[PDB]
Amino acid sequence: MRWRADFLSAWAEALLRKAGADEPSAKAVAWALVEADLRGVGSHGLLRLPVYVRRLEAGLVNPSPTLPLEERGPVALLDGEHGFGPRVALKAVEAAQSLARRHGLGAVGVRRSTHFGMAGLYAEKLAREGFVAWVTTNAEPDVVPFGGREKALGTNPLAFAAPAPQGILVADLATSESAMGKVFLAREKGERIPPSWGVDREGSPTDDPHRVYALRPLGGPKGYALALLVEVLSGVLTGAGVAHGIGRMYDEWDRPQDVGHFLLALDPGRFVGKEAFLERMGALWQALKATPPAPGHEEVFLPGELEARRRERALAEGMALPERVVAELKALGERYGVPW
Amino acid sequence: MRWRADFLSAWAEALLRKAGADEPSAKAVAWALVEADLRGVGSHGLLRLPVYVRRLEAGLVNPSPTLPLEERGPVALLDGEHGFGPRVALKAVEAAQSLARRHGLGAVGVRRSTHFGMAGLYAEKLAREGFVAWVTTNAEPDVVPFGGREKALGTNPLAFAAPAPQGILVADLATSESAMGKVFLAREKGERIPPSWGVDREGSPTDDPHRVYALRPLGGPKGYALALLVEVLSGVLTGAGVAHGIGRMYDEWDRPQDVGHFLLALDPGRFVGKEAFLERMGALWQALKATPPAPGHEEVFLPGELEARRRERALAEGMALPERVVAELKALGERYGVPW
Ligand SMILES: NC(=O)c1ccc[n+]([C@@H]2O[C@H](COP(=O)([O-])OP(=O)(O)OC[C@H]3O[C@@H](n4cnc5c(N)ncnc54)[C@H](O)[C@@H]3O)[C@@H](O)[C@H]2O)c1
Ligand SMILES: NC(=O)c1ccc[n+]([C@@H]2O[C@H](COP(=O)([O-])OP(=O)(O)OC[C@H]3O[C@@H](n4cnc5c(N)ncnc54)[C@H](O)[C@@H]3O)[C@@H](O)[C@H]2O)c1
């Protein structure tokens, strides 16, 4: 069976408000999770709602942050006050847009935030507003540094978006080879995993998901370097938590997380020009789409293109959700008196 | 035998001036190439001097660009006028520093440049000046887009640096799995290469360097997405050449290259604070260095750390250079009357 995004979004918002979150926060979270599911990124979709609500219940998420903002020129610092990541991040997007419109560039350093879901959503929103956007967030350590055997950095994703005539280019990638969610999945299906995904407690690559102690960086040294880029911009520079100081959303419940985010919006109008940029992006997009395919492929796609086609189809015919996820959501709704 | 950096640098500058380059350009190129060799990045060191000079001889490189600069707020656009990449890039570094010091952020969009060598050198220079830095450059297409069988993008590297008490963090990476230089090397040694490096003319991975038609992106879709990030910032946004419009330094001699670069400097002082940033970077650096090593490793290193230790050793005991490279340099010096 398939579900309607409008129904799921309204339901999620209603549930969150019943749980104590203010309207802006409830709307922001419903948006982030449902929009991720629409694009096929379920790892950051509604399956996260249950834990998000548990964190709120435990008093680890601010239900109504005022979101203090301080700006000077093209720079702004945002205090998330431990509010829901999507709520904090959308305010940062608003600030980045305003700053870039006035200064050509707009950088927002966010601290004291929490898990904000799919980084690409924020980058895409800024791009649809006409900006070239860069969005990063750090996360609790799950990845060993290159050459190490103990966790040092989170999956720390980097997202980058830019508008084109044919669509919105959206690069959104974790800096680790894989993700714990995929490892746990393999554990259930009793399948082997590529040794490139993780290492055992000794620090040696393993093809057994049951033996994975930590994730490995994408392409060895490079993914490790990229994870540090994300950590520096997201946590060190912002005043937020850094690595082990961030807080594990699933494992540590003694204090709120202190996730950091970094957002940068650039106005093409102050560079090559708004319309010129659009045309140039169009030429590049066209050239890529015209590229003859490699074996096993029918055509080349731009990052974010398949995600957009998936969202379009999901809006047109409904969204597919794992039976397990639906069960959890239904149970969550029932205990709060918000019928699914 | 080993060579002295001071001798090589002075010699390179002298040769370039004899070839017609003005003093600033000669000094800039000598610096870029020798500093790359010192750090162990020979692929962008003196072995490049011969072709750089040939491009100059052919009138494809401006020997004395005036480097027109236009600024508005935290944004600057630089016209390299086809000058040597290192000369153009160092001017961009100067502009980025000035802008960031006054606005908190400084972005420079460079167009009509040429090959500028090691991207990390420019990022490192900005970091040693106290800034968090981002430096990118596009390059003539050598890499197929994910899912494609024809070249669409250059090795398009991304560099990122930030100061720490223990040293300068310098992330510097091509977005391709490997590089043509390594493929050609394998071709000579008649060795097999990892199929992850390149594809044949049909677009299928190959372990035979003799059959490599194009390079593959780092980690499939991710490296492709990163290469596009670099292309958008370096070429599309700046007004420089884009992909096939850049110009192949080794293969096309009908017109100067139009390489683009993007530089961003951020003042920690406008975010968490200069001294606070330094301390936080120090804590992160310390944590990484203290990470127990994985098998085959004795300790964990920060990106740029091994490069710094190599440069220190090279300054202390001299630089090692391939006999083939030395032969080429000697021949170059002889035809110009600048004895090696
Ligand atoms: N909030 C957090 O703490 C956190 C932490 C880690 C990851 N994440 C999110 O989890 C998600 C993880 O994504 P991922 O790293 O697995 O990325 P991925 O491997 O699925 O893809 C990376 C990039 O490749 C592009 N791509 C994939 N297949 C393609 C194809 N066939 N043709 C062209 N382009 C293609 C995508 O559009 C994307 O931009 C992201 O949305 C990330 O933001 C969030
Ligand atoms: N001018 C151009 O057009 C152009 C094009 C492509 C590449 N390049 C340059 O060529 C060079 C290519 O570099 P690369 O992609 O092969 O990078 P690489 O694989 O050698 O390393 C990538 C990153 O990994 C880090 N690293 C490597 N080994 C490590 C270890 N043991 N511990 C910790 N960190 C480690 C490095 O410090 C670096 O920041 C770069 O300097 C790049 O700027 C220039």
Query: How far does the CA of residue B300 sit from the closest CA of chain A (Å)?
Result: 5
Count of beta carbons in the 10 Å neighbourhood of residue A66 = 9
Supply B142's token pair. Answer: 């050598």
Among the listed residues A275, A272, A102, the one whose alpha carbon sits nearest the alpha carbon of residue B78:
A272
* β partners of residue A242: none
Q: Which residue has the tokens 């310098």?
A: B170
Taking phi first (over 0 means left), then psi (-120 to 50 degrees means alpha), and beta for anything else, what does residue B14 get? alpha
Q: Which residue has the tokens 């948006």?
A: A31
Q: Which of B15-18's residues contact partners 24+ apart within 8 Å by CB, and which partners?
A: B15/B49, B15/B53, B15/B332, B15/B333, B15/B336, B15/B338, B16/B53, B16/B56, B18/B336, B18/B337, B18/B338
Count of beta carbons in the 10 Å neighbourhood of residue A128 = 12
- What spatial distance separates the first Cα and last Cα of chain B, rounded to whole Å? 14
Write out chain A in H/E/C secondary structure: CEECHHHHHHHHHHHHHHCCCCHHHHHHHHHHHHHHHHCCCHHHCHHHHHHHHHHHHCCCCECCCCCCEEEECCEEEEECCCECHHHHHHHHHHHHHHHHHHHCEEEEEEEEECCCCCHHHHHHHHHHCCCEEEEEECCCCCECCCCECCCCECCCCEEEEEEECCEEEEEEECCECCCHHHHHHHHHHCCCCCCCCEECCCCCECCCHHHCCEECECCCHHHHHHHHHHHHHHHHCCCCCCHHHCCCCCCCCCCCCCEEEEEEEECHHHCCCHHHHHHHHHHHHHHHHCCCECCCCCCCCCCCHHHHHHHHHHHHHCEECCHHHHHHHHHHHHHHCCCC
**B73 neighbourhood in chain A, CB within 8 Å:** 73-74, 103-105, 270
CA A195, CA A205: separation in Å to the nearest integer?
5
| Maximum C-alpha span of chain A | 55
Closest CB to A228: pick one of B146, B171, B292. B171
- Determine the length of chain A: 340
Which amino acid type is present at position B179? A
Among the listed residues A215, A231, A247, A242, the one whose alpha carbon sits nearest the alpha carbon of residue A148:
A215
Count of beta carbons in the 10 Å neighbourhood of residue B251 = 7
Count of beta carbons in the 10 Å neighbourhood of residue B1 = 8
**A177 neighbourhood in chain B, CB within 8 Å:** 219
CA B132, CA A242: separation in Å to the nearest integer?
16
- What spatial distance separates the first Cα and last Cα of chain A, rounded to whole Å? 14
Closest CB to B243: pick one of A203, A287, A303. A287
Contact assessment for residue A160 and residue B229, using Cβ atoms and an 8 Å cutoff: yes
Contact assessment for residue A263 and residue A122, using Cβ atoms and an 8 Å cutoff: yes
- The answer, yes or no, to whether any atom of ligand 2 lies below 6 A from the CB of B116, is yes
| Interface contact B75-A271, CB threshold 8 A | yes
Q: Which of A157-160's residues contact partners 24+ apart within 8 Å by CB, and which partners?
A: A157/A119, A157/A230, A158/A119, A158/A134, A158/A226, A158/A229, A158/A230, A159/A119, A159/A120, A159/A122, A159/A123, A159/A133, A159/A134, A159/A135, A160/A123, A160/A132, A160/A133, A160/A134, A160/A135, A160/B225, A160/B229, A160/B232
Cα A299 to its chain centre, rounded Å, is: 27
Contact assessment for residue B198 and residue B217, using Cβ atoms and an 8 Å cutoff: no
| Interface contact B219-A224, CB threshold 8 A | no
Structural domains in chain B plus CATH codes = 1-66+304-340 (1.10.1530.10), 67-303 (3.30.1370.60)
Among residues A44, A82, A115, A261, the one annotated as catalytic is A115
Query: How far does the CA of residue A125 sit from the closest CA of chain B (Å)?
Result: 17
Give the experimental resolution in Å: 1.8
Contact assessment for residue A187 and residue A181, using Cβ atoms and an 8 Å cutoff: no
- B118 Cβ contact list (under 8 Å, min separation 6): B32, B35, B36, B39, B41, B44, B172
- The answer, yes or no, to whether any atom of ligand 2 lies below 6 A from the CB of B89, is no
Supply A192's token pair. Answer: 């082997």
Mutate to test the interface with A, among B111, B229, B275, B278 (most CBs of A within 10 A): B229
Q: Which residue has the tokens 């993780």?
A: A198
Contact assessment for residue A37 and residue A49, using Cβ atoms and an 8 Å cutoff: no
Query: How far does the CA of residue B44 sit from the closest CA of chain A (Å)?
Result: 18
CA B91, CA B127: separation in Å to the nearest integer?
16
Eight-state DSSP code of residue B270: G
State residue A285 phi and psi, 5-degree precision.
-60, -50
Closest CB to B272: pick one of A202, A219, A239. A239
Supply B86's token pair. Answer: 């290192």
CA A115, CA A214: separation in Å to the nearest integer?
20
CA A53, CA A115: separation in Å to the nearest integer?
12
**A277 neighbourhood in chain B, CB within 8 Å:** 236-237
Contact assessment for residue A230 and residue A136, using Cβ atoms and an 8 Å cutoff: yes
Cα radius of gyration (chain A): 20
- The answer, yes or no, to whether any atom of ligand 1 lies below 6 A from the CB of A234, is no
Count of beta carbons in the 10 Å neighbourhood of residue B59 = 12
**Method underlying the structure:** X-ray
Supply B298's token pair. Answer: 């004795």
Query: Pairing mode, if any, of strands A69-72 and A167-173?
Result: unpaired
CA B331, CA B322: separation in Å to the nearest integer?
14
Beta strands in chain B (DSSP E): 2-3, 69-72, 75-79, 105-113, 132-137, 158-164, 167-173, 198-199, 214-215, 259-266, 319-320
Half-sphere exposure in the Cβ direction for B319 (13 Å, CA)? 26
Among the listed residues B162, B86, B159, B137, the one whose alpha carbon sits nearest the alpha carbon of residue B262:
B137
CA B240, CA B196: separation in Å to the nearest integer?
30
Q: What is the DSSP string of B6-41?
A: HHHHHHHHHHHHHTT--HHHHHHHHHHHHHHHHTT-
Query: How far does the CA of residue A336 sit from the closest CA of chain B (Å)?
Result: 40
Catalytic annotation, residues of B: 115
Q: Ligand 1 centroid vs A84 CA: distance in angstroms?
A: 22
Among the listed residues B18, B154, B265, B187, the one whose alpha carbon sits nearest the alpha carbon of residue A74:
B265
Which amino acid type is present at position A111? R
Count of beta carbons in the 10 Å neighbourhood of residue B51 = 13
Among the listed residues B229, B241, B238, B212, the one whose alpha carbon sits nearest the alpha carbon of residue B139:
B241
CA A77, CA A71: separation in Å to the nearest integer?
6
Q: Ligand 2 centroid vs A30 CA: distance in angstroms?
A: 40
- A41 Cβ contact list (under 8 Å, min separation 6): A118, A120, A307
Contact assessment for residue B132 and residue B266, using Cβ atoms and an 8 Å cutoff: yes
CA A230, CA B166: separation in Å to the nearest integer?
20
Compute the C-alpha angle A154/A158/A159, nearest 5°: 145
Mutate to test the interface with A, among B196, B228, B285 (most CBs of A within 10 A): B228
Cα B216 to its chain centre, rounded Å, is: 19
Q: Angle of helix A23-38 relative to helix A85-103, nearest 10 degrees?
A: 90
- A266 Cβ contact list (under 8 Å, min separation 6): A100, A104, A105, A106, A131, A132, A133, A134, B107, B237
- Determine the length of chain B: 340
CA B89, CA B66: separation in Å to the nearest integer?
13
Count of beta carbons in the 10 Å neighbourhood of residue B146 = 24
Q: Which residue has the tokens 């560099």?
A: B159
Among the listed residues B67, B63, B149, B135, the one whose alpha carbon sits nearest the alpha carbon of residue B97:
B135
